[PDB]
Each structure stands twice: as structure tokens, then as C-alpha cells.
Paper text:
CD73 (ecto-5′-nucleotidase, NT5E) is a glycosylated 125-kDa homodimeric membrane-bound enzyme which dephosphorylates AMP in the extracellular milieu to adenosine. In the physiological form two monomers associate through extensive noncovalent contacts between the C-terminal domains forming a dimer. The active site in each monomer of CD73 is comprised of substrate contact residues in both the N- and C-terminal domains in addition to zinc cofactors bound by the N-terminal domain. Following binding of the AMP substrate to the C-terminal domain, the N-terminal domain and zinc cofactors align with the AMP in a “closed” CD73 conformation in which catalysis takes place to generate the adenosine product.
A separate structure of CD73 with a Fab (TB38) which complements TB19 in a particularly potent biparatopic shows its binding to a nonoverlapping site on the CD73 N-terminal domain. In contrast to TB19, the TB38 Fab and CD73 yielded structures with each asymmetric unit containing two CD73 dimers in different conformations with all of the monomers bound by one Fab. In both complexes, the TB38 Fab contacts residues solely in the N-terminal domain (including Lys-145, Ser-152, Ser-155, Gly-156, Leu-159, Lys-162, Glu-203, Lys-206, Leu-210, and Asn-211) and all six CDRs are engaged in the interactions. Mapping of the epitope residues of TB19 and TB38 on the partially open structure of CD73 and by sequence alignment show that the epitopes are non-overlapping, albeit in close proximity in agreement with the binning results. However, the hybrid conformer of CD73 when bound by TB38 has not been reported previously. In that case, the two monomers of the CD73 dimer might be capable of independently undergoing the conformational changes required for catalysis rather than acting in concert to maintain structural symmetry. The presence of TB38 bound to this structure also raises the possibility that TB38 even when bound might permit CD73 conformational changes required for catalysis which would be consistent with the low level of inhibition observed for the monovalent TB38 antibody (15%) despite its nanomolar affinity. However, a freedom for TB38 to bind CD73 in a range of conformations, as suggested by the structures, might at the same time improve the chances for the antibody to be suitably oriented for crosslinking.
Residue numbers in the entry:
A (entry chain F), E (entry chain L): 1 to 212
B (entry chain A), D (entry chain B): 27 to 549
C (entry chain E): 1 to 219
F (entry chain H): 1 to 220
Write the structure that this text describes.
């Protein structure tokens, strides 16, 4: 299948300009894919913003203004309010009935508690190995915007197997926090020298490394 | 909120400029039409006015070699260069069947294309999914305009849409869709479509929400004031129509043949109600210069036409006798061929339902200016036909009293003698002359085909009866002394290009066997 | 005025059939398209199915091809979805949204309904310690915690030294592992100096299975 | 080195078994032909002989609904199931144009398909590149056998091959390519192709290297001894032909419509010389059972035919008068329609160049067994026609003396008034009866269309002149009392299936206007 | 573009049977691609072997016999001679003019006994770094047959960029030998912990590792 | 008897045009197809171009599309290839081969001809040492050498201690780096005992630029 790829997260200053793009894995996005953007308050019914690529829907503010940049459909927010901090979904209709969503772009506009993450990487336990399970715990604390990408590796080799990652969750101090688990087998844990948890946060990559 | 609306219709793929009667361009200095010309005047307006819309209402798809060659691709890659805003589907858009619309146009076309009354079922439904839309919300300035589409339910009788397409009643299908526009805070709603001036007016009346109606299909011409050419108006432009809820709804239409560009300033209130509506269809006389950058892209494509002139269209297995000493005196097979191609071409791609049963044709010898030889390889190219029909006329449809028809047939032999190419080669007619009698009392038998009769036969012509007949424009305008037609004709609609009509007939027949079969006799 | 409500709500075991309804009001139901969209909690949006205006046309996503069956009833202004052969990847929020006949668009969205399909047994937590590595702390302290793995009835309480330590503790959100079993951790930052001096025992209570483990954490 | 050669030709897509005259199968017990049947007998032979080749020489394409529906794909996915070894291209393989050969067949076909005298130029050249080959080296046992293809240079006159295919003179193009086989130690060289029994013999004579010639196109039947059915032989099988270098070259050919399977044991020396050549074409009568596993795969495909029966083919805009009390008494438009479809169908897909000039048709009323009503969206489906032409006959071509033609036209009215279906609906004829006169002296005028009088006109019938005419097989067999035809006919070739001929004409015309136009008159 | 993929190298007992296959990256191979096999003694004009898939050419030995196995065209050499130690090219014609060859299969027959390889890996020099170039030298010795696969690793990360590998070259002792160079930048050499040269010979994988 | 002769592609600098000829004899040239195939030395076979018999049809590979022009002259039983806009990936052996029309064979092949297209310019080698750290050869001995990088002779001599050591020496094949410049190494196996005891100096001569470097090799 074909993936609609749109930025995973963005941050903007209040009263700023920001553009979300939304591209197609194989080929360009044109008008004749009928682009279409939605605002979802996390955990709420997604409200419409713009259909046709350009057309604003009933009672959509004029600050929101859709376009196309080269390969990708686009959404320009000229003059952000604090009212706009939510998740934005792009989505195209390649006809025959075939409709496909984007991954969703999380747009943050707070007023500058802007703090990089605190990563605490734990091995599988004294005792856990002995139960024949083997779980790598990677903890994140004290970051804003509250949008992270958790990459795992072994000795410079990516792992896509058995990775589970929580949704970021505002702490007791209005900064975001999230955990990331990697379930493994005692073999795979001893076979590779060291495992690493790579957390990236507004281009600020943070790693930690553990081995027996 | 003023909204200038540029509209066209029934353009019949006349991409290069024509002459006033919509034939081949003759006097360079005096020619009209052209998409070169049109571009100029549209760009002039857009560079002046702030609120402009450029619409078409179909029949863009048949007429010249241009289509016969590029088959809809010429349409797209030029309409896209003029930067149209929306278009509706036509009687003639399905002449190449659905995929001769869906492939060349609906996919390659860079602007939305509408009709709401056309629904597909089965597997075509998935293929065609959202290449043809029922309405469009087209933003102009800081406001939005709704445009709703329609297409004549007559289409399956004048085209080849396959059996997967349904044509719902215009009114039925529009109402629920116009209502949705108001459901989504669109106050300003244009109707745009190809059902005929008649239905356009019934849309005004019987569909609430609808503010403006732009139509075509009927070659009808609306002017306020003095007509700027031979075009006879049949109402003021715009044509106001009193709606049932009690609104003034302006209904518009350019002639056809890309001769006149529609021009209508519509002023709206804050809630999407028509308050003012004034303007007149801009004629494209030679005083508008043709845009160069387009006239270039025209001549770039001109080359693949020239290439088609020499290509074998199909083959004859008989001599096509077109010499003076044949077609100007007695019944020649060439005539019989052409007339048959004229009628046949008409009953596939009929312009309106009024002509879908037309079985009568006439043709002067003085339009048949060459024979075509078989001996070579039996091969027949376009260039061959250019020798036969070098006048680049059209085949037009005329409604005629039998009295008038009799008159013209006596004028076929009143001054017999030498070449005088007024002798009529007929199709769907049996005639017999007795030359012994007085000039103007020589037609002793004249049986014609009465199709508006259950199983059609040749029944003798009644001088009272009205007769729907196809013939060259040369004759509709009283060529070779035929003043009695130009005067006593009842209806006259310009048709397709003469050569293009044969070249199609020959292509689709592939093998011709045009015989002399006793349509015309003596005693 | 216009809205869409859905029905479904419940939890079901993998395989069983399940029907979904979407009660519409305040518009010409007769005219608009009607879709189903799902959203796996935390994850993005996925297109499910669609029913058009006249009936003829129904389309489904490659992901639920012929596993799922959509049906519209304009007689009753309600949309239906028959979901046979369920699994864990179908666990998500299920919205019905209307489409105007435009770009076949999506103006109005429903409140949405929750589809949870698991084996879903009432679980005791596996508890494990977490080896206090000085690799996160600088100013003469180290971070250590305890892992609460594989449990089902949320919530689970976590104290430290019978709740005689609330200072420096950072218990985390539970993750929902693809098996429909929760797992979380609870970390606490303490000084290096108290290794041989002070004892750290994390205490878990999970009254929904009455499992109340109390595991010590040593280097 | 003994080599059994199974060969077919002019199978004319008769996929399911027919009757002796190549029509619809009637008497289950007595039917012949079939690919079900053929499979059986070929499998029997392959399980007996060690050295077998199964060849075809074209005209596989045109014939039944089978093709009209699957358009060549039925051919491939069956010939591939029969496990043919080679095939040549035919007069009729280009009836659907190049793409109606290249798409359905040349892509789907799992065995080599040859013609060496067909050269493609321009862009088609690249597309078609090596899907049709000039020659093929087919290894049999421990030896190797070369097979050369050819196709009639007359193909462009009997098909629609596009203008990008050239047809070189068979002999010219074969010679240089046969030489290359000997250049590659191939001693044993079969020629295989569709140019007509006549050219096949001139290939034997004039082309060195060539050991055996397998042809078709002419439908010609060769038998050594007593013919096992109505099939009149015209030479022994094989037909030995004295080459110019002075060798004995056996030339073969099965009767057309997949009735006879060719069977020829050829014994070679160790350097590729024919020493022995004996055998006779195996007639496929009902004593050979139809194979079950194929008769299954036949009825699997049967279903998509039934589906096409109810689909709209095209439309009429007139009543098709086919009632007994019309077509059995006076000139009815249905007849005029059919006759026209019979002739027209013939001049596109002509079987040989002898019939490319056929302008004359006759049809008994007792073959027109229903009318077709319009006004119901004007629709005409296959099922409609099945009611009109339920006999599942064919339209055959007969050469006839004027004397004989006159005789049959008097038998049109000899004992008129009851007319148990004797009355002739004509095409390419003007006839006039005076009923007052003696039965067998009632035809007062009979003008017919002359075959190559330069420009085709209606000249009075001379009883000395010979006349090439199409008519139903019911009448070529002297059905409603026409013993005068069955006896005094000069040539008789079976044509295509009756219903299939109309259904095509209607499809390709799309809109029909069949009128009563005074072919038949009284006093 | 489409790659015709045929086995990289093969080994056979004299008087033994071996089959070379030849597949298409995208789709199956049928007869209607007109398979076609060639013998090249490396650096002589390649002798034709088999056209049509099955047809032998004039004076081709009978031991060579072409076929089709499922997805791939094939060449069976039933009864190998010493005469058959050559490089064998498959090739298919996808029409429009388009002909595409195979990578070539190098067929080794008995000469020696099967000796596994000897890898000596060198770092970039004291002095080389200072010229701003940085070249990893990997040497191979004393293996039979003469067909090796040279894999490089960054840590557990493949690199195929800037790797140059010589043609195997019969030594002074009738066993084969070849070098493999990897051009790098002084940054790339220090950035990654350790670089490895992985050589595999008849399934017999040999690695060596070097780091700053 | 039947034969194909190619025509001499020598050496040329990138960009220049170059015409290639293929003289056929001993068959109806008039009848068969005629191709070009190239072979980059050490690499596989690549299809270049084709001319068929009836004339209209000439086809090229996407790799040499409109860069190359093929032309047959039946008047003179010779096939031609016009190679404009050359580069280093065109450096290869260029064979002309016949095809019979039938099962679209490639019958008969030429001996072939060589096309070498480079920035010819004759460079002295960069020489560097190679670290004798005991981790390649068994407990008793160690391996050390010297790297000869970037040079444009094919040929270059390597001795050890002025050629006073032939025992344990294993000089390797030159590689042709993508720059069209050669590079090689020369290793020698010696005892661990002589690292601190004996001096090893690899000596390079490359008489085609007269550059004669003499680099010592010590452990680190
Ligand atoms: C199907 O075709 C086969 C092959 O022709 C038929 O078998 C053949 O039948 C004919 C007529 O019965 C036989 O000819 C007769 O031969 C006898 C002597 O055997 C002679 O006394 C008769 O006067 C006549 O010449 C022919 O020999 C026989 N051939 C074989 C293969 O035995 C078969 O009858 C046909 N079946 C049907 C129902 O058409
Ligand atoms: C092209 O059309 C325009 C508009 O009809 C012509 O301009 C008019 O000419 C008439 C006669 O001279 C005047 O009475 C009108 O007042 C003019 N109108 C305007 C707005 O200029 C123009 O002459 C035509 N050109 C040609 C040569 O046909």
C-alpha cells in the first residue's frame, strides 16, 4: 500500500507562521488528489479545516490557508493563536473509493517552558532474565513541546521488533513525560554487545547505552 | 459584490479561427473565433476585473479534424492553457464513449468538470470515481461561489455513453445538491449545463437556491441591443426568468462555435441574492489580436494534423465518379456516398433530438470538384477528399416546406444545358425528371423518406408538409441561384466541417461500395 | 441541528462478529456520502469503509477488505458496519463521518465509539527490580526503580518503603502492549551514599486481583 | 526418420462442434468438429507416435459469437490447452486490427506464431517486436525441424492490418530465410502459411530447401481415395509437386471449419530429404468422443457468452418489420437490413479475393421469424436476433448463372399467396413481378449490380453472365423448393454464422435506419 | 530498471551435474522471454550455447541442456568436463528492442582441493590521515575455488559506497587471491568504533576488525 | 567461412566522438540482425544497441539512449556504432554479434575491440606504510606492508630492503579506482622477534614518471 507521510510534530510561537506539508511515498500530490486537512483535539471528534486544498470550510478562520508546495500538499497557519495547539491530519482520495490518511502532525504553541528531555535507560533485571523474558526500559522526563521520536539500536543496527512506546503525558510540573519498552529474548540480549535508546526532541538527539 | 462571468458553450473544437458563417477561415483580415483570439480577451479582462469566472457548458468535443485527430487531448491541454474555472458535460462529450472522455479529458484536465444528473453503476462507478463531480465550491476573491452541473437526459440518444451511465432528470438531481450548498453557507449558486435553452429556463423557475443559470446545447443567441453580426437574437442578454419563490434569475448562452465569449456582471447582496445583471456577449471580430504564445502552441500541434492528411483512412473497391461531366448532369456515386456520410454522421452525433431521425440530404454538383481513383491500391486519404470538397464548408440542417423543396428541384434543371453545377445529387429521395416539359414543371415523381412514419418508406412529397433535411452551407445560403432556400427555410443550424464528415464515415466503414442505384431518372 | 451518534461501545473476544450503528439527524441523509474511520488509541487515523448517495457503490480499505461489510438504511436515517473476524489491530475508536458529494469531502464527524477486542483476562503483575546504574545523575545521586509487567485491570498503586518516601519518585503511564496487557515502571532518584545505609522497597497493590508484591532493589 | 504432421487451417473459431454444413449442432448423435473432439484424437496419436507436430495455418480468428465475445483470447487459452507446436497468420487474424491480434493472442499465446513476409515499420515495429516470428526451429526427438511462415499479400484487401504492416511477396521473403536454416544445419524445413492452395504449389516449385508445404486460405480439400463425407476432393493428399530443382514436394490442407484434422507421415533420410509421404485427413465424426476435461472448460466460458446476449449491441430508430404477413409477401426492411449486413460483413472479412466484389444477396422470408420493436430506448440485443434467425444457419457465397438466378426468382412466386416462405427479400437487385402472368413467367424486370462494370450500376441480368451472390445455407441446399440452386450452382463456400453477422453489423453501425426503398415492385 | 539475477559463482565435481538458474527481479521467466545461455572463457569472445531455452546450437555438446525451473530460466550441465570451467551468461528479450544480460555465473570444476581464504586487514596509516584521505586495505590469499563475497561493516552497518575489490587472481601456487580497498574520510574512521572486512568463500565466512 | 571483425577503438579523453566498425564476411549480411555488446573488464556483459535486417528498426539500451547511434551499411557488409559524449563507464570491450531472426538467438560473436576513455595523465604514486600489529599471522610472526595509492602506470616495481628480502613477500593485483588511477598493496610476513630488532623499508620505482619513493615501516 501507499503511505501519506506528513511531518510527525511541529512547534510555533504564538502569532507566528508555520506550514504543515503532506506528501505521497510514490509520486507527487496534485490538486486532482483532492487534499483535505482536519483539526483533532487529542481524544475529540476531528473538526474540518480545508477541503479542495485551498477552499476553507464553513466558519474556518482566514489565518488557516491551504496550498501545494512542489511534491506535497500544504497548510499554512499565518498568525497562530494558543487556541491552535492540537493534532492536524492531511488525507487524499486516489479514487475508486480509495481514501488514505496521514500519520498526523502534533502542533505545539505554548509560551516557552521549552526544555530538552531527561533519558534514564534500564537493563533487563537481575531476576527478569531468570523468568526467560527480557525487557529494555527507556524512561523520558521534563520535556516540552512533548513530542519525541524514540529510536532503538544495537551496535549501529536499527531494531523494529517488539518496541512499545507510551503517548507523551503532561507531568505534575506541566512538562511532558513518556516511557518506551523493548520486549526481547535472553539470547538477543547476550548476542549483541550493547543496546541503545535514541530519543530525538526538536532536533536535539539524546542516546543512552546498556550491555551485560 | 460584483462578479464578472465569462462563459462559452457548443465550441465544437473550432480551435483555430473560422469565418462569420462558422466554415474554414478565408479572408485572414476578416476572420472570427479562435482560442488564440479568446485567450487575448480573457487575459485583458482578468488583468482589469478582480472577480472573474471562465465557464463552459460542453459540446466542446466534436466538429473539426482537430478532434478527429487528438480525440479530446487537444481540448484538455488548451482549456488548461486558457485556465478555465469549471466545465459541464455535453451531448457530444460521449461521442468517443466513456473512455474517450475519461482517458483523454477527465484525467488529463487540470480543472473540475461537473454534472450532477449523471450517475454510473457497476464497475465503471469505481474507475470514474470523482473525475466528474455534481457541484463545485469555487472560491473567488474572499467569497465563495457554488457551481452545480447538469447534462441533457437526451444524451444516450445523441451519443454513445455505454449502458453503465444513467441520466437522471436535471431538476430532480440539482435540487438536493443546491440545498446542500445552502446547508454549507453557500448563498451564491450558479447552475451550469447542457440541456438546451428550454430546460435552462425551467431550472430557473423550479429549483430554489439557484441564483444564475448558464446553459447551451441549443445554438440560441441572446443579445441586448444591435446584433454585431448575422447572429439573430431570440431574447435579451441576460434573459430574466421569474422564479416560483418570486426571484429574477438571469439565464445566459453564447451562440456557439467559439465566435462569441459570454460577458455578464452579476452584483450580489450580503446573503447571495442577484440585485443587478447587465452585459452582452463579446463578439471576437478581427479587431481582437490573436495571442502569439498560443498561436505558436497551435502551429506546434498543426504538424500532427498535416501528418494525418496523407494517412490511409480506408479503401474503396469502386471508382468514386466526381468529374464535372458526371455529378453536374446525372446521379453520380460520389454524391450518393457523401449524402450517405452526411446523414449517417448526423444520426450518431445528432446536435439536438430535433434532428436525430433526419433521413433526407441534397448536394449540388458544384460542390463535387474531383473523383477518387481505386486503380492505385484502393487507398483513400484526407488529401483525396480536399480535392472533392475544397470549399471547407459545413453540412447544415434545415427544416423546409415541401413547396420550397419542389421549387429548388425545378431550379435543379430550369437552365440545364452546360456545366451550371446546380444539379442536385440526392440522398433519402427518389426523383424523376421529364425534360420535354416546361422548365419549372419537369419533376414528374418526387418521393421522400417520412421517418416520422412508423416503418419509413418513400411516400410522395406533399407541398404543405414540413421536411427536416441536411445539405451544404453553400446551399443553405442560396449558392448557385437557390434564393428560395435562404428565404423560405424555417430552421437553420450550422453542423460539422464537410471533409471531416466524410473522413469519419470512411474510417468507420473501412470499405466503401457507393453505387448509382436509380435515385434520379428521366423518360 | 446536525449531528452523528454511534453505537458499539463494548469489549469482545477475537473472532466474534460485531455490528456498529451511526444515528444521523438534521440533514438530507438521502443525499450525502457516509464513511467509517477508526483511530487506534494514541496512533493516527485510518480509513475503514464508505457508502455513497444512491447505494450501488460501497468501498472498503485493503486492511478490512471483505472482513467488514457496510450497509446504509435511508428508510431509518442510520448507517451500519458488520465487523466479522475481529483481532487486536481492530482495537480502536470508530467514527462515522458524512461526506458532501464535492471532493467526496468530510465536513461533519461523529463523537465516535470504542472497539476493544482482547482475550482480556484479569491479570496479576509480574514485578522485577531495576539495577541502579549511575548513568542519568551527576550531583552525587543515582536513579533506580521497579518494573510492573503484564497486568489487566487498571489501575495499579506504587509506593516506596510502605509510602514513607514520596520525595523524588516518578511513576509513569502504563503502556498497552499489543497483547492488551498493561506494563509500567516507577523510578526514584536517591543519593549514592545510602547504598550500604538505606533500604529501598517499591510496593505494588492491584486490588482488582488483590496481588500486593513488595520487592527490594539492590545493586 | 518418420514424422507425423497433424495440421489444421481456416478453423474460423468453430470452438464447439457443428453439423456437416458447419452450422449450429442439431442431431447430438451425428455432429462433427469441436476442440473437445480434436483434443481426444490428437492425444490418441501422441500416445502412439514418437515424432508429432500440431500446426495451424491461420483464419482461426473470425466465425462464431465465441470470437465476437472473447475476440481472440478464447483462441489462445484453448490452442495452448491443445498444446499446438506452431501457427501462421491469416487473412482474418487482422480483422480486429493489429491490437485485436497483439493484445488477445500474441501476448496470451504460449506457442510460436510465424509469418516471414509481413514486415512492420514505425512505432508498431517496436511494440510487436518478436511476438510474431518469421521462422522457428522446433526440435523433435534427437533431430531438429525448421518451420517457415507466410501470409497472403492480399491480406490488406481482406482485413484491417493498419498501414504500419507491409506484406512482401511470399516466395521473395521465404527464400532468403530458408537459406539461413541450411546455414544453421537445418535440413528438414516445413513451409506453413495462409496464401491459398494456388501459392502453396508455387512455393513447392520455386523455393529451394523447402521439404513440405502446409497451407490454407482456400478451404480446398485433398483426399487420396474415397471421401468420407460430402467434401469433394480436388487432388490426392498429399499433393506431390515437381520443384524446379526437380524434387517431389508434398503440399497439404484440411478442409476448413475444424471438421478435418490433417494427418501426414513423412519419412526423411539422415540429411533432410523426403523419401516417403502417405496419409489422409482424419474426419472428426461423432465416433470420436469429446474429451470431458475440455468440454468442462468450454461450459465454464459458455457463461460469458450468455452474459453478452442481453447487452445492448446498438439501436434502431425504425420498426424492424419481421412478421410473417410482411416479409413473406412484400419487400420488408428487416430483409433489406439482413441482406445489407450479409454483403457488408463479407466485404470487410472476405474469405478470398474472389468475393471482395460481392454486391448481391437473396433471403427467403422463411428465415425471418420475428420483428424487433424500438421506442424501448431503441435497444437491440443478441437475444432479439435469436428470435429473428433461430435456425443458427450461415450466410454462404455461391457463383450462379443468370439463367439459374431467373429460375429461383420465378420459384419466389410460382404458387404465391400461401408462400410457405419462398418469397425472396433481395439486396443489390431490382426485381419487378406481374402476378397476372403464368407462374414461371412473372419476372418482367430483373436488373442486378454488375461486379466490375467500372462504376457499379444496375444493368439488366443476362442469362449467359455468371453472378457471385451471398445467401443463407438453407437456400444453397434448396430449402423451400430451390432445387435449381443446389443443382446448377458453380461454386459454394460456407460463410460465418447468421446471427453473429447481424450482431456485428449492428455493433459497428451503432444506429440503423433500414428502409423499404423499392427493390421489389408489382403492377 | 530490471535486473536479470543469476547465481554469482558455482563449483562442481568433474563428471558431476550442476544447474545454473537465471531469474527476473520483477515477475517470472517464461519461454516468451526467449532465454539464451553463453559460455565465455573470461577474455575470449563468448561462444553461443543454447537459444529458445531448450534448443542446442550446431556443435554444442549434449551434456549442456537448457530448461525452465518455476520462476527462473535454467541451464543443466549433466556430466561436467574440465572443458566447462568458464563464466556463463543468461539473457532474456522483453521486446521493443530491449535485451538484458545476467550478472554472469563463474563455474569452477575440480582442480585443487577446496581451500578456505586467509584475510589480513590493515587500518589507514599514521601518515595517510594527514593527507586527508583514509583507506582500509583488506587482503585475501590461498583460496580455491576463486569466488569470494567482500562485505564491509561500519559497526553492524553495511557500506557499499567507495568499496573497490580486485578480480580474483590465481597465485604463484595455483590458489586464488584478491585485494579489497575501502576509501574513507578521517571523520568516518574516528566517528564509528570499529570497521570490519567480511569475506565469505563457499559458505565459509571470514571477518577481521580494526579501530583507532 | 563466416566471421566478424571489429574496428579499433584505441584510447580517447572524455567527450570526444568515436566511430566503431564491424566487418562481416561469409553470409547473407543482408538477412541477419546485428548488435553491439560491451563488457567492462572484470564485470559482466551489457547490451548496447541493435540493427535488424529489414532496416526501419534500430534500438538502444536506456544506458546509451541518444548518446549512441548505430548504423548498418549492407552496400559494404559492415556495421557501425557512433559513440558521442563518452565517459569512464563506456570503458569496456565492444563486441559486434549476429542474431538469426528466429528464436532471437545471438549466434556468432566478434573477437571484440577495446574502448579506454580516461583522464590520461601519468602520476607518481602516493606511498604510505601499513601497521605491523600482531593480529593477522600466528603467534610466531606478524604481517606488515606498504600501500601504493593513486598511480597511472599499469606497472610499478616493489622491493624490500633494496630487494634484499624476497622471503614472505606477497605483492597483490592493482585495483582500477573509479578515478581511472591504479592503487595496490605489497605485504610481507616476518617474525615478531625482528619488530624491535630489524628494519623493513619497502622501495617503489615507477619508471613511467621516474618517481622512486622508499618508505620505512615501524610499529606504533
Ligand atoms: C466415422 O468415420 C470412420 C472413418 O471413416 C467410419 O469408419 C468407416 O466407416 C465406413 C462406412 O461404414 C467404412 O467403409 C466401409 O468399409 C466396409 C469394409 O470394412 C465396406 O464393406 C463398406 O462398403 C464401406 O466401404 C470404413 O471402412 C470405416 N473405417 C474404419 C476406420 O473402420 C465410421 O463409420 C464413421 N462413423 C460415423 C457414425 O459416421
Ligand atoms: C468589431 O466590433 C466592434 C463592436 O461592435 C466594432 O466597434 C463598433 O463599430 C460600430 C460601427 O463603426 C460603431 O457604431 C460602434 O459604436 C463600435 N463599438 C465600439 C464599442 O467600438 C468594430 O468596428 C468591429 N470591427 C470590425 C472591423 O468588424
Amino acid at each position: 500500500q501507499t503511505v501519506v507521510t506528513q511531518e510527525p510534530s511541529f512547534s510555533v510561537s504564538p502569532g507566528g507562521t508555520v506550514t504543515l506539508t503532506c506528501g505521497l511515498s510514490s509520486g507527487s500530490v496534485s490538486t486532482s488528489y483532492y487534499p483535505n486537512w482536519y483539526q483533532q483535539t487529542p481524544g475529540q471528534a476531528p473538526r474540518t479545516l480545508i477541503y479542495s486544498t485551498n477552499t476553507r470550510s464553513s466558519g474556518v478562520p482566514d489565518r488557516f490557508s491551504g496550498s501545494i508546495l512542489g511534491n506535497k500538499a500544504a497548510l499554512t497557519i499565518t498568525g497562530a493563536q494558543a487556541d491552535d495547539e492540537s493534532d492536524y491530519y492531511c488525507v487524499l482520495f486516489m479514487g475508486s473509493g480509495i481514501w488514505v490518511f496521514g500519520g498526523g502532525t502534533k502542533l505545539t504553541v505554548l509560551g516557552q517552558p521549552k526544555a530538552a528531555p531527561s533519558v534514564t535507560l534500564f537493563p533487563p533485571s537481575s531476576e527478569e532474565l531468570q523468568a526467560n523474558k527480557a525487557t529494555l526500559v527507556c524512561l523520558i522526563s521534563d520535556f516540552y513541546p512533548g513530542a519525541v521520536t524514540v529510536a532503538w539500536k544495537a551496535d549501529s543496527s536499527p531494531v523494529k521488533a517488539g518496541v512499545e512506546t507510551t503517548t507523551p503525558s503532561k507531568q505534575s510540573n506541566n512538562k511532558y513525560a513518556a516511557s518506551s519498552y523493548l520486549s526481547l529474548t535472553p539470547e538477543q540480549w547476550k548476542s549483541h554487545r550493547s543496546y541503545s535508546c535514541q530519543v530525538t526532541h526538536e532536533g536535539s538527539t539524546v542516546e543512552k547505552t546498556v550491555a551485560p | 459584490w460584483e462578479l464578472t462571468i465569462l462563459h462559452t458553450n457548443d465550441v465544437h473544437s473550432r480551435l483555430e479561427q473560422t469565418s462569420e458563417d462558422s466554415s474554414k477561415c478565408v479572408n485572414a483580415s476578416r476572420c472570427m473565433g479562435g482560442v488564440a483570439r479568446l485567450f487575448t480577451k480573457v487575459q485583458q479582462i482578468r488583468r482589469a476585473e478582480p472577480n472573474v469566472l471562465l465557464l463552459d457548458a460542453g459540446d466542446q468535443y466534436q466538429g473539426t479534424i482537430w478532434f478527429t485527430v487528438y480525440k479530446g487531448a487537444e481540448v484538455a491541454h488548451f482549456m488548461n492553457a486558457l485556465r478555465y474555472d469549471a466545465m459541464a458535460l455535453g451531448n457530444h462529450e460521449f461521442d468517443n464513449g466513456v473512455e474517450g472522455l475519461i482517458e483523454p479529458l477527465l484525467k488529463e484536465a487540470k480543472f473540475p468538470i461537473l454534472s450532477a444528473n449523471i450517475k454510473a453503476k457497476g464497475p465503471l462507478a469505481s474507475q470514474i470515481s470523482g473525475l466528474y463531480l455534481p457541484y463545485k465550491v469555487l472560491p473567488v476573491g474572499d467569497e465563495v461561489v457554488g457551481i452545480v452541473g447538469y447534462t441533457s437526459k437526451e444524451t444516450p440518444f445523441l451519443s454513445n455513453p455505454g449502458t453503465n451511465l444513467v441520466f437522471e432528470d436535471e431538476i430532480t438531481a440539482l435540487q438536493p445538491e443546491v440545498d446542500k450548498l445552502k446547508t454549507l453557507n453557500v448563498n451564491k449558486i450558479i447552475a451550469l449545463g447542457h440541456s438546451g435553452f428550454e430546460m435552462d429556463k425551467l431550472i430557473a423557475q423550479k429549483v430554489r437556491g439557484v441564483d444564475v443559470v448558464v446553459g447551451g446545447h441549443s445554438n440560441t443567441f441572446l443579445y441586448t441591443g444591435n446584433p454585431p453580426s448575422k447572429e439573430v437574437p431570440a431574447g435579451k442578454y441576460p434573459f430574466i426568468v421569474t422564479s416560483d419563490d418570486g426571484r429574477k434569475v438571469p439565464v445566459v448562452q453564447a451562440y456557439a462555435f467559439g465566435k462569441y465569449l459570454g460577458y455578464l456582471k452579476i452584483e450580489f447582496d450580503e446573503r447571495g441574492n442577484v440585485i443587478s445583471s447587465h452585459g452582452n456577449p463579446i463578439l471576437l471580430n478581427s479587431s481582437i489580436p490573436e495571442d502569439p504564445s498560443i498561436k505558436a502552441d497551435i502551429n506546434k500541434w498543426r504538424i500532427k494534423l498535416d501528418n494525418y492528411s496523407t494517412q490511409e483512412l480506408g479503401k474503396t473497391i469502386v471508382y468514386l465518379d466526381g468529374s464535372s461531366q458526371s455529378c453536374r448532369f446525372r446521379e453520380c456515386n460520389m454524391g450518393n456516398l457523401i449524402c450517405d456520410a452526411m446523414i449517417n454522421n448526423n444520426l450518431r452525433h445528432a446536435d439536438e433530438m430535433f434532428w436525430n431521425h433526419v433521413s433526407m440530404c441534397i448536394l449540388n454538383g458544384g460542390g463535387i470538384r474531383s473523383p477518387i481513383d481505386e486503380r492505385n491500391n484502393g487507398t483513400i486519404t484526407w488529401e483525396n477528399l480536399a480535392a472533392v470538397l475544397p470549399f471547407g464548408g459545413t453540412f447544415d440542417l434545415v427544416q423546409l416546406k415541401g413547396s420550397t423543396l419542389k421549387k429548388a428541384f425545378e431550379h435543379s434543371v430550369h437552365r440545364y444545358g452546360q456545366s451550371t453545377g446546380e444539379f442536385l445529387q440526392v440522398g433519402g429521395i427518389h426523383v424523376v425528371y421529364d425534360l420535354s416539359r416546361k422548365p419549372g414543371d419537369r419533376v414528374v415523381k418526387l418521393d421522400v423518406l417520412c421517418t416520422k412514419c412508423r416503418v419509413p418508406s418513400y411516400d410522395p412529397l406533399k407541398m404543405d408538409e414540413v421536411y427536416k433535411v441536411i445539405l451544404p452551407n453553400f446551399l443553405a445560403n442560396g449558392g448557385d441561384g437557390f434564393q428560395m432556400i435562404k428565404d423560405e427555410l424555417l430552421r437553420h443550424d450550422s453542423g460539422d466541417q464537410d471533409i471531416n464528415v466524410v473522413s469519419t464515415y470512411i474510417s468507420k466503414m473501412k470499405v466503401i461500395y457507393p453505387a448509382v442505384e436509380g435515385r434520379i431518372k428521366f423518360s | 441541528q446536525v449531528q452523528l451518534v454511534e453505537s458499539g461501545g463494548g469489549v469482545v473476544q477475537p473472532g466474534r462478529s460485531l455490528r456498529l450503528s451511526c444515528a444521523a439527524s438534521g440533514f438530507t441523509f438521502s443525499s450525502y456520502g457516509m464513511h467509517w474511520v477508526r483511530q487506534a488509541p494514541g496512533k493516527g487515523l485510518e480509513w475503514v469503509a464508505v457508502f455513497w448517495y444512491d447505494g450501488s457503490n460501497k468501498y472498503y480499505a485493503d486492511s478490512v477488505k471483505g472482513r467488514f461489510t457496510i450497509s446504509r438504511d435511508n428508510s431509518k436515517n442510520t448507517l451500519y458496519l458488520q465487523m466479522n473476524s475481529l483481532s487486536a489491530e481492530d482495537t480502536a475508536v470508530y467514527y462515522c463521518a458524512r461526506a458532501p458529494n464535492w471532493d467526496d469531502a468530510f465536513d461533519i464527524w461523529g463523537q465516535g465509539t470504542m472497539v476493544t477486542v482482547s482475550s482480556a483476562s484479569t491479570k496479576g503483575p509480574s514485578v522485577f527490580p531495576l539495577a541502579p546504574s549511575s548513568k542519568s545523575t551527576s550531583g552525587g545521586t543515582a536513579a533506580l526503580g521497579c518494573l510492573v509487567k503484564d497486568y489487566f485491570p487498571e489501575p495499579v498503586t506504587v509506593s516506596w518503603n510502605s509510602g514513607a518516601l514520596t520525595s523524588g519518585v516518578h511513576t509513569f503511564p502504563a503502556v498497552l502492549q499489543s497483547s492488551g496487557l498493561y506494563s509500567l515502571s516507577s523510578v526514584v532518584t536517591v543519593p549514592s551514599s545510602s547504598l550500604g545505609t538505606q533500604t529501598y522497597i517499591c510496593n505494588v497493590n492491584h486490588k482488582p486481583s488483590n496481588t500486593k508484591v513488595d520487592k527490594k532493589v539492590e545493586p
